[PDB]
Amino acid sequence: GEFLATTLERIEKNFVITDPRLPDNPIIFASDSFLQLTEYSREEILGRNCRFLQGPETDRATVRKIRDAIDNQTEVTVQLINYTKSGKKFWNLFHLQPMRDQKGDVQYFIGVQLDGTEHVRDAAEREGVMLIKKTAENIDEAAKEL
Numbered sequence: 001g002e003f004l005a006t007t008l009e010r011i012e013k014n015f016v017i018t019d020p021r022l023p024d025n026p027i028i029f030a031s032d033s034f035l036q037l038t039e040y041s042r043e044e045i046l047g048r049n050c051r052f053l054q055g056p057e058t059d060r061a062t063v064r065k066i067r068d069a070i071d072n073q074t075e076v077t078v079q080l081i082n083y084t085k086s087g088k089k090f091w092n093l094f095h096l097q098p099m100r101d102q103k104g105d106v107q108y109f110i111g112v113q114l115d116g117t118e119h120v121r122d123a124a125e126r127e128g129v130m131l132i133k134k135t136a137e138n139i140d141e142a143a144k145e146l
């Protein structure tokens with residue numbers, strides 16, 4: 001269909017990239033795995049703020065932690081309930097970090113989502129955060145020259 005995946009978006013990891021220069025910090029790249037998890041097509045996601053994944057059981061306190069991170073241009077790692085297109089719930093161990101250019105200005109934000117069936121703690125939380133941070137570092141490389 002529309003918006004065939006770029007090579008970046010075929011990286012076998014769940015992430016999105018947003019452009020904070022664009023009204024409402026919208027998604028501009030979304031990986032195939034993100035599409036698969038969320039049940040949206042790429043055309044349905046692009047140019048939208050990622051908050052469309054939130055729903056009734058999403059903890060708004062947690063959403064404010066993300067808002068504040070973006071506002072302060074800093075990373076955050078949180079867990080929150082998200083919803084697919086068809087309204088199926090999933091937990092999202094979510095890591096955000098800015099991507100900076102060669103003058104240290106924030107160019108994009110990188111978001112990595114690890115979907116799970118439950119809030120994780122201890123070993124599962126640690127291994128999850130290990131995974132999403134390593135992924136974010138990989139994408140910071142991948143995205144640098146877009």
Ligand SMILES: *[C@@]12=NC3=[C]C([C])=C([C])[C]=C3N([C][C]([O])[C]([O])[C]([O])[C]OP([O])([O])=O)C1=NC(=O)[N]C2=O
Pocket residue numbers: 016017018025049050051053054063064066067070080082092094096109110111112113
């Ligand atoms: C979404 N992932 C995600 C990825 C990036 C790179 C960015 C910048 C944001 C997200 N969001 C958070 C959302 O877009 C928004 O920043 C928050 O809702 C806070 O702002 P508001 O204006 O709504 O108070 C993500 N949100 C999700 O729920 N799930 C993700 O995967």
